[PDB]
């Protein structure tokens, strides 16, 4: 046991001892992603490794919005990390300090969630409209083991009652889930955010940064790492890492890189740690403009080639083909971001979200789902402006579509074949803008940049156990896997927390840092949380109202209330407005 999980304020504020033999240890980190930079920060702070011994290998040499970066309060590893990181906006404060102070002065909530019939709000908005069978299937999925859900799709565990509910409409759009996705990952998602079911439709439980995660999270970490003398090597293309797998231990021996076009090798010892971010969701991302579509592609990038090269060496390094291959053509591929300063586009937006987009505060509260759209288009507007040099009179909205190969409503072309204006054409169509001024507002009054990510749905692909490698593989001395494609316990991928948690576990295991890693929050194992979930799932109903029709449940409930009458259980039932 090279690590142990913990919770509470004891292990939270505790600093560990300097681990043994660190001063003779180095670290090479492949990529400059969020997980990679988090691991470097943990090595500096918790590992007490000097910055000169840490190397960041970056492929690249020395308005686009990567939306869907929702955050919540119980990102335990994220706030553990973003505590010692000083901020860049205000002085004598941390990244968490600004985030805490900004989310308490302007709480995030959505006054409108789903619209249909070209602008009109959904009549059953706010309600989940989950049937008894739909709630049963939700409970059945959560009560099944993770081992029994290998290579199981969403459609295999849910019926048509679930998909016709408003709960699935919120769930499939918040997390960009698809019906052909991993049931293991969805079951992790249900259990992780079971305490946010009350704040699911209105996004009251969601927290957002002042800007994009690049300048709010990545840039503060870059400034922090550069202050400690962390070496950043650029123009480094990592081909493969030579691993010798013996029956007793596995050591990274050598890395083959392409340093500025010249292929050369770095030698490794047992002390020289290697952190690999296997796979990438932003790799091979072709871009477009307001006049031409983003060209589709399926070219495996550097991150996917490295994982394929590593996987050939050992079976327990994971299967990269289960994520980067055979991605359905109906999956989410194309995302667009549209920037405009035109008044009547903003006025139409304000007429739907009931808030001023130029006010500088929460605008939409999150995303807005177009239920009638064939593309399953969903758009969001964050706290404008999300960028530094962006003018104060301009807004930046982010548009993504779930289905890809279906013709749109206003434009009879798939999202993959539509240019930047054409995506903006159908977006204005569903906002209630008339079909006369719709054309010139997109082509001239707005600038929309499409982007085609062929791997933006890879983390939710159906997988088995061992498809994702462990964060530290078994019997591994200096090799770690970080990012959204590393296997850890009870955590949800495609979150900032997952990348940070994998970074923390990798550093703590390799360096034998004897401090408790904060576990995933115990919401699914909490009596109070589960009781609030039951109330919220069936549209704010008491136990008498939930079982008012079924005789088998009515008899069981009558016996239950008799045995708990005048007890602390009944007090728990009443205070959670279930009785």
CA angle 116, 494, 528 (to 5 degrees): 80
Tell me which of 28, 170, 189, 224 is the catalytic residue.
189
Binding mask of the shown chain, residues 353 to 372, with x at each position contacting a second copy by CB under 8 A:
-xxx--x-x-----------
Among 34, 222, 257, 521, the residue binding a second copy under the rule CB under 8 A is: 521
User: What whole-number distance in Å separates Cα of residue 200 and Cα of residue 194?
Assistant: 10
Applying CB under 8 A, does 215 fall inside the site for a second copy? no
Nearest approach in angstroms of CB 260 to a second copy is 25
Nearest approach in angstroms of CB 579 to a second copy is 14
Residue in 453, 53, 499 with CA at minimum distance from that of residue 491: 499
Catalytic (active site) residue 70: yes
Applying CB under 8 A, does 101 fall inside the site for a second copy? yes
Nearest approach in angstroms of CB 237 to a second copy is 18
Applying CB under 8 A, does 343 fall inside the site for a second copy? no
Tell me which of 28, 70, 487, 498 is the catalytic residue.
70
Applying CB under 8 A, does 244 fall inside the site for a second copy? yes
142 versus 218: smaller Cβ distance to a second copy: 142
Q: Encoding tokens for residue 295?
A: 């060209």
Specify the 3-state DSSP secondary structure of 82: coil
Nearest approach in angstroms of CB 496 to a second copy is 13
Applying CB under 8 A, does 393 fall inside the site for a second copy? no
Contact between 379 and 371 (Cβ < 8 Å): no
172 versus 383: smaller Cβ distance to a second copy: 383
Applying CB under 8 A, does 512 fall inside the site for a second copy? yes
State which of positions 121-180 bind a second copy (CB under 8 A).
142-145, 148
Nearest approach in angstroms of CB 216 to a second copy is 16
Applying CB under 8 A, does 93 fall inside the site for a second copy? yes
Applying CB under 8 A, does 465 fall inside the site for a second copy? no
Stretch that binds a second copy, among 42-50, 95-103, 124-132, 370-378 (CB under 8 A): 95-103
Catalytic (active site) residue 189: yes
Scan for tokens 């807005």, then name that residue. Answer: 368
Residue in 187, 82, 71 with CA at minimum distance from that of residue 462: 187
H or E stretch at 481: strand 479-482
- φ/ψ of residue 87, rounded to 5: -80, 165
Q: Please tell me what DSSP assigns to residue 149.
A: G
> Is it true that the peptide bond before 385 is cis, omega within 30 degrees of 0?
yes
Q: Which residues contact 523 (CB under 8 A, 6 or more apart)?
A: 74, 191, 192, 193, 194, 195, 529
Whole-angstrom CA distances from 247 to 270, 274, 440, 465, 538 are 16, 20, 67, 21, 53
Applying CB under 8 A, does 239 fall inside the site for a second copy? no
Residue list, annotated binding site for FAD: 34-35, 58-59, 66, 69-70, 238, 280, 302, 496, 499
Nearest approach in angstroms of CB 83 to a second copy is 5
Among 20, 223, 298, 344, the residue binding a second copy under the rule CB under 8 A is: 20
Applying CB under 8 A, does 14 fall inside the site for a second copy? yes
The footprint of a second copy on this chain (CB under 8 A) covers a number of residues equal to 66
Applying CB under 8 A, does 75 fall inside the site for a second copy? yes
Q: Which residues contact 404 (CB under 8 A, 6 or more apart)?
A: 329, 330, 331, 332, 333, 334, 414, 415, 416
Applying CB under 8 A, does 392 fall inside the site for a second copy? no
Q: Encoding tokens for residue 531?
A: 């009781």
Residue list, annotated binding site: 34-35, 58-59, 66, 69-70, 238, 280, 302, 496, 499
Among 25, 53, 69, 74, the residue binding a second copy under the rule CB under 8 A is: 74
Among 64, 66, 73, 557, the residue binding a second copy under the rule CB under 8 A is: 73
359 versus 555: smaller Cβ distance to a second copy: 359
Applying CB under 8 A, does 299 fall inside the site for a second copy? no
User: What whole-number distance in Å separates Cα of residue 66 and Cα of residue 426?
Assistant: 20
Stretch that binds a second copy, among 212-220, 455-463, 485-493, 512-520 (CB under 8 A): 512-520
Q: Encoding tokens for residue 445?
A: 């009054």
User: Are β-strands 479-482 and 273-277 bridged in parallel, bridged antiparallel, or unpaired?
Assistant: parallel
Q: 177: phi > 0 → left, psi -120 to 50 → alpha, else beta; which?
A: beta
Contact between 81 and 90 (Cβ < 8 Å): no
Applying CB under 8 A, does 106 fall inside the site for a second copy? yes
Among 91, 105, 389, 392, the residue binding a second copy under the rule CB under 8 A is: 105
> Which DSSP string corresponds to 184-238?
HHHHHHHHHTGGGSTTSSS-TT-B--SS-HIIIIIHHHHHHHHHTT-EEE-SEEE
Among 60, 61, 62, 104, the residue binding a second copy under the rule CB under 8 A is: 104
Among 64, 218, 245, 579, the residue binding a second copy under the rule CB under 8 A is: 245
Applying CB under 8 A, does 100 fall inside the site for a second copy? yes
Q: Please tell me what DSSP assigns to residue 295.
A: P
25 versus 443: smaller Cβ distance to a second copy: 25
Nearest approach in angstroms of CB 351 to a second copy is 9
User: What whole-number distance in Å separates Cα of residue 440 and Cα of residue 474?
Assistant: 59
HEC readout, 384-435: CCCCCCCCCCCEEEEEEECCCCCCCCCCCCCCCCCCHHHHHHHHHHHCCCCC
Nearest approach in angstroms of CB 76 to a second copy is 5
Contact residues toward a second copy (CB under 8 A) are 8-15, 17, 20, 73-77, 79-80, 83, 93-94, 96-97, 100-101, 104-107, 109, 111, 142-145, 148, 244-248, 270, 309, 311-313, 315, 350, 354-356, 359, 361, 512, 514, 518, 521-522, 525-528, 566-569, 571
The catalytic residues are: 70, 189
């Amino acid at each position: 046991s090279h690590m142990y999980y913990s919770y509470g304020n004891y292990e939270a504020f505790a600093r560990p001892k300097k681990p043994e033999n660190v001063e003779n240890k180095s670290a090479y980190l492949i990529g400059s992603g969020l997980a990679s930079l988090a691991a470097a920060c943990f090595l500096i702070r918790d590992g007490q490794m000097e910055g000169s011994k840490i190397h960041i290998l970056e492929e690249l040499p020395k308005y686009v919005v990567r939306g869907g970066r929702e955050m919540e309060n119980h990102f335990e590893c994220l706030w553990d990390l973003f505590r010692s990181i000083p901020s860049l906006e205000i002085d004598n404060a941390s990244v968490l300090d600004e985030f805490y102070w900004l989310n308490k002065e302007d709480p995030n909530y959505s006054r409108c969630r789903v619209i249909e019939k070209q602008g009109q709000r959904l009549v059953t908005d706010g309600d989940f409209t989950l049937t008894k069978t739909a709630i049963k299937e939700i409970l059945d999925l959560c009560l099944t083991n993770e081992e029994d859900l290998d290579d199981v799709k969403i459609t295999d565990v849910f019926s048509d009652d679930f998909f016709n509910s408003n709960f699935w409409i919120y769930w499939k759009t918040m997390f960009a889930f698809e019906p052909w996705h991993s049931a293991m990952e969805m079951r992790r998602y249900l259990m992780r955010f079971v305490h946010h079911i009350s704040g699911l439709a209105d996004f009251s439980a969601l927290k957002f940064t002042k800007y994009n995660q690049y300048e709010s999270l990545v840039l503060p970490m870059v400034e922090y790492l550069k202050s400690h003398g962390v070496q950043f090597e650029y123009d480094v293309k990592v081909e493969d890492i030579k691993i010798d797998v013996t029956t007793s231990q596995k050591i990274a021996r050598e890395i083959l890189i392409d340093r500025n076009g010249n292929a050369e090798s770095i030698k490794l010892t047992i002390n020289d740690l290697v952190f690999v971010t296997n796979g990438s969701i932003t790799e091979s991302s072709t871009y477009g403009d307001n006049d031409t579509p983003a060209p589709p592609t399926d070219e495996l990038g550097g991150s996917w080639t490295l994982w394929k090269n590593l996987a050939r060496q050992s079976p327990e390094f994971g299967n990269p083909d289960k994520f980067c291959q055979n991605i359905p053509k109906k999956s989410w591929f194309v995302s667009a971001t549209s920037t405009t300063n035109n008044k009547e586009i903003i006025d139409t937006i304000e007429s739907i979200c009931k808030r001023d987009p130029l006010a500088g505060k929460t605008v939409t509260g999150g995303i807005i789902t177009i239920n009638d759209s064939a593309w399953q288009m969903s758009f969001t507007i964050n706290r404008q402006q999300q960028f530094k040099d962006q003018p104060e009179n301009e807004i930046s909205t982010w548009i993504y579509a779930l289905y890809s190969d279906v013709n749109g409503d206003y434009i009879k072309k798939p999202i993959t074949e539509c240019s930047g204006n054409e995506i903006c054409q159908e977006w204005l169509y569903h906002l209630g803008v008339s079909t006369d001024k719709i054309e010139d507002l997109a082509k001239h009054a707005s600038n929309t940049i499409p982007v085609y990510m062929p791997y933006i749905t890879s983390y939710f692909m159906t997988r088995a156990i061992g498809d994702r490698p462990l964060v530290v593989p078994h019997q591994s001395q200096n090799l770690a896997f970080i990012g959204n494609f590393a296997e850890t316990e009870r955590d949800t991928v495609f979150t900032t927390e997952y990348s940070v948690r994998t970074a923390m576990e990798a550093v703590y295991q390799l360096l034998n840092i004897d401090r408790g890693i904060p576990e995933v929050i115990n919401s699914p194992f909490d009596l109070r949380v589960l009781m609030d979930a039951i109330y919220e799932l069936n549209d704010h109903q008491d136990l008498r109202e939930i079982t008012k029709d079924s005789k088998m449940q009515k008899l069981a409930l009558a016996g239950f209330l008799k045995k708990i009458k005048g007890t602390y259980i009944e007090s728990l039932l009443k205070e959670h407005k279930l009785l």
